[PDB]
């Protein structure tokens, strides 16, 4: 039970362990400082500014596969409530990766097969 | 992650801040005192009655783009739990605006990108 | 009986024997931002409505509300009118104009014998 | 430039002589005194009430091809301006007939084929 | 179990009481004397002549919603056998109304709910 | 309220008077004596046999719009019960005509429009 | 082998070695209301059939029977014929014409050796 | 030969024995005294009003699979003529049940297979 | 002139003579004693049970064109009223054949073509 | 704000006031003692058995609009948590009506429009 | 491996035991002595004429769900070779039933599940 | 202007020399003496009987791609008039071959290209 | 269970007796000597050469319904194994006919109906 | 409220009592020790590998209705929160069965119908 | 080279080596003793009963992907004749695996590529 | 009457003589020793493995019409039983050719056309 | 990167830094029946493959095998090449050509600072 929603290209992946959740996000062309990242309960929010390709007035864009929007964001409802305060994150090479330990109440417990 | 539902034409907008939600509602031709408004948890209700164009018996309606219903309403499920008791509201020029501070358990905490 | 112009603005048009009422929805517009003129059989309504103002902390996460700031309507009525005696009031987002008909446009009875 | 418009079943025909226009209108079930008829210039208006089939509480309508609306009307733009003040009209057998003499400015004059 | 059939515009309605049947018929533009009306058992027949709009040779029909046919008729099979001989009828304002008391064998009798 | 049914091409017409029914039937190429015809109540039957074009063995049919069947028949349910015993009939030029006086219980009585 | 004209009139066309028979349905027509001529390879049939006559007491409540009073057919045959020796009989609504073939149109044997 | 017809949701079932017809009818929400039930020959009529769900002005209908109409009725033509005067009926728990003994003339008599 | 209706596969044919109707019914795999057969007026009823193919628990049905229903029936409305009391019937080889003499009132009488 | 789900025909309506929810259920032909009714939190369960129309072996069902299932049920999720212990319910005339007072935590509080 | 093929309506069913095949066949209207039945290897043939419904020249077929063909036949390839010489057969009530013991080489031998 | 017409499967080919026309025709299964062949002007006629495959009452036709018609014929309009009296024809191996010398009036003469 | 396959127009028929199989083949325009014919078990092979219409260089083919292929053949799998060595064949008039007595193992044996 | 989701063929069934949920799951080809099973709140997870059909290099798979994937899993959101720590489970014959007692807060309490 | 056929869900795979065929069958929820397994020539038969999920009358099936049939079977025709007597079989974990050594006459012998 | 089946691109041709079958197979890029080939009865098998285009890590495939699979195979059911032990085979230039003499029981014997 | 010509002949095209390999399926063709030339950026392959030879006793009863005897391909490559140092081998129905790139077509590095 997960829902993404927001504006602008931003490919997400979601990885679930027994005791945590990893979220991965593509943000090519974004500055680490331009990225806000907050969470609580079962929701994670990612906000990003990417400034546009700056062209001198000599230059023209004669071809482009690259999205224009400068404001981009995603709100992600995850399969488990998490501990925001132990959440880590790094940002290398256009890729954001967030680690979100699960709250105890959301950690599943085994059932033996007899 | 939002749900609107009820009877009547009533264009809604929803604005999220870090610590509040604003809801805006179009209600042309309604009287401030004919509006009821309550909330709790993560749900807002707006009720309204707008009386119909009153024609003398000499006059006929020869053309109307204007909805007829006299009972109108909306129930709105917001993306955060709120503090009803600090909610304020205004009604100017056919437009209702409601401010609803977020409850502390719904306020999101930062994660640092190291 | 032709409407035409830019922007969301629900009109209704009422006819009496001696006048035309025109009603218009203009939620979110300020009385002083509305221009209103007329002559012969045509009525013009122009309005500006400024956009919902957001602090830089806030985002719009959902909107059914039109964005255009310039809105107008030209309305050709089923009778010539007297502009000079035309009245108008603006309550609660609703504009109502009253437009007495010109004498030349007032219909006279025929008897069914 | 013959434009009919209004509400209600009401079949009109329109007959043009050199010096007049005849409008014929079906209004079965209407009382002569419940009919308003006015004109000016090149427009004719016909307004009528027809009260509904009267049923005692014993009776039921088990079949009907007969329109139910009580308010019925028509505005008709003619192909010539007329002299309202000389217009006549009878109402026999559910049929209204209106005679509308043409204004002089609207009476066509001949061209000789030499 | 009712069947209309015949030629020409003639909107019928049918009303049923415990002890009778009313039939209503629109016949704008028809002369009372031009209408034959007979019945037996469970069938009613209505025959009508309406003569055409008569135009002088100056005049032209430049527009018409009004049916042309001069012979019009309807045969109506009703939900009950009736007493023709006690049948009444009046014709006002383009509308024929026929009253047709039910035969005794066709009058339903109540059933008590215990 | 009519039903035809049976085998073969046989164009039927039906004429109603106040006191009779006439039925007309096309039967090209049939012999008056090869026709059976009976009635009772409100049903007429027509039976007929038409022998086929007889070709010598030198001759071939190189084109035919003409039905082939030799047995042909029709059962016709009329809108009134009849007196069989006063029924007459004629057969001229491929056309059969039958006159069938109505029984007294099927003859319709007038209603006066007051 | 072309048919053409106005009105319901089922034709059949039979060929012998030495003649053409033409058959035609004309129910409700009077022998004397039928004109019949021919030449070379063409046959014409014209007929009038008067309408079903109704007293003013009677109504037609159902009809599968064509209404046209003028009916005709022009038929181009697969051989030239001798008009002058053409015969014809009219029984029971059915017209039958016999049309001997012209000599120039009679086919001669070829032997299969 | 089995025709239903009239206004309103009202699921009928029909049951034939050798010597009677049973009609069953769903009429949830209806009052025993609000039901009229009469019959003659081979027809049964059922009439019933059901008053609408009543709401205080605090309350709103937020959802509803339940038809709204208040006047509801059924005319039923049965496969047999019956004896009205011996017809009984019960109304328990939303369900009307009607027992209609067949008339003698309508009771089928056996044929032996030899 | 005919209506069949009921449950089950059971091909009927219907034969009309001057003085009787013959009904024929396919009923393969039914037992002569399992057949009930009654009639009155213009309606015949055939009822039949056929028991299912009997399999031992060793055996499986590996292919089957043969209907499964065990209750089968037809109610037939004929083109004439009949004399039930003089009706005979035979059951050979899966085929039921019923002979139903017409009642006098339903026998057609000749009309002479002069 | 609502989800219904389960097996069987069983029209529900749902009414919301300020302080309670009313659920209404069509259940014609069910017995008050055959109805089980429980609730907790924001979910109501209705279970019901209705036994089938009872036919003697003389009798056949010749026509039926009436569902056959005998096990019927609904699980309903309401727009508010409720107080199960103060819930009442009535079963008249095939109609079940349940009253479910809202829990305090689910009651909405007013906001003033200044 | 199960192929039917031939002329005429003839509903087959096929039944397998461990040690035989049963073929069942519908042949209503057929005479025991008009049926030929032979077999070898894994094929069975069934041939049968049924003479047509016989009508006096007074009588007409007015209706008929019953196939007309007189020659009817079935070739059936079975899932097993059989012993023709021990095959039996009965013909009661329209139904042919054939019992075909399997040949030894075709009888399956068990495998134990260890 | 090459027109073929008649009944029956009979493939024709047509070959044109300077001074003749060859017609070839398939007629497998036909006896040379059952073929009639005549011509005049620009038309050739071919008539043939082929009697059907002869089956003893032991045998059955279990498959067939071979046309059944016994009467077969063709009329052929050629692109030139011919001299019937000098026409020859053989019939070998189911194939008829006809040689038809061209009439002098139909023999083309050369044009020199200068 | 029969399969044809091969190249070129060659209409086949297949006739089956109790003790043999007849195959018939159309081969207009083929020389008896140009036809090879072999068989074994349950398959028959037919090979044929037909040489093309030979045209002098004066002549043109201006129209043709006649297949061109010179090599034609069919392999036919029959419903029974046969005795090749007792197989006869004749070839008259473009038609090949082959007689193929059945092998004893393929001759079916009767089953008595008791 | 009942959501399945994940990789692989694995037919689930879900069973509710008053005081528990039973989950059943098909897992043919899987080893008891290759199955992981955990739960908390209202979610159950099932994970399982099944190794693939093993073929020697002589052998080939010539046909296969059997899915190939080796990793298979199911996340299931149930209609009730449960008590993980008392959940049991058996795995016989391809079938996993899990018993999940409901938590007290989720057990529905009865309402009396007065 | 293969035909499966029978009743029920039961995924088969088929493995061919040089000297045997392996058949694999999904049969989750079946009991080893409820499985019958025979073979001969080139055909294998698997028969199985599986009893239905057992519910107490407290419990309801609220969701189910799991087939219901209790009788399930497959008849399989293999690409080789086999030695039934040396066939083995195992049933673990819902999976049946049968090993079927090829008969000598069905074992392929090498051909050398020179 | 032929069946091919297996994995991979491998264009097959089949040539029949009176006394043999030749099979030709395209196998570009396969090594003579990587080909297995066996036969018996009326079935031929061809197995082959072709290793993939081997690219150094500087090189990329920028375009390929060439199938990728490394395992390829074909099983071929021929129209005659063969003598495996006299089968020969060749493999030149990517093309395999196999000669397979027919067994004596599959060699067809002549029929004389008398 | 354009292919064009007559006949079934699956090509693949491999690029290195310094050369282009071209592979081509030509089952049933004789090494000596293959012509192979090139220049600048274009490669041509022509081949004849003679048809499956049948004795007059034998018939082809089924064939998935193309019949055309003339087959060819013209291939325009993504670089100009050195024809003179082009090699080529033909094993097992498969033709493989190696075509070193011309100097003017060899790409040079750019550094990412």
Residue numbers in the entry:
A (entry chain D), B (entry chain C), D (entry chain B), E (entry chain D), F (entry chain C), H (entry chain H), ...: 34 to 147
C (entry chain A), G (entry chain A), Q (entry chain A): 35 to 147
Per the authors:
The small heat-shock protein (sHSP) class of protein chaperone is an energy-independent class of chaperone that act as holdases when combating the potential of misfolded or damaged proteins to form aggregates. sHSPs are also assembly chaperones, associating with protein polymers, such as actin, microtubules and intermediate filaments to modulate both their oligomerization and their assemblies in cells. HSP16.5 from Methanocaldococcus jannaschii (MjHSP16.5) was the first sHSP to be structurally characterized by crystallography. The protein oligomerizes into a particle containing 24 identical subunits with octahedral symmetry. The crystal structure confirmed earlier protein structure predictions regarding a central α-crystallin domain (ACD) forming a β-strand sandwich comprised eight β-strands (numbered 2–9) organized in an immunoglobulin-like fold that is flanked by the N- and C-terminal domains that dock onto hydrophobic sites on the β4/β8 edge of this β-strand sandwich at the fourfold symmetry axis of the oligomer.
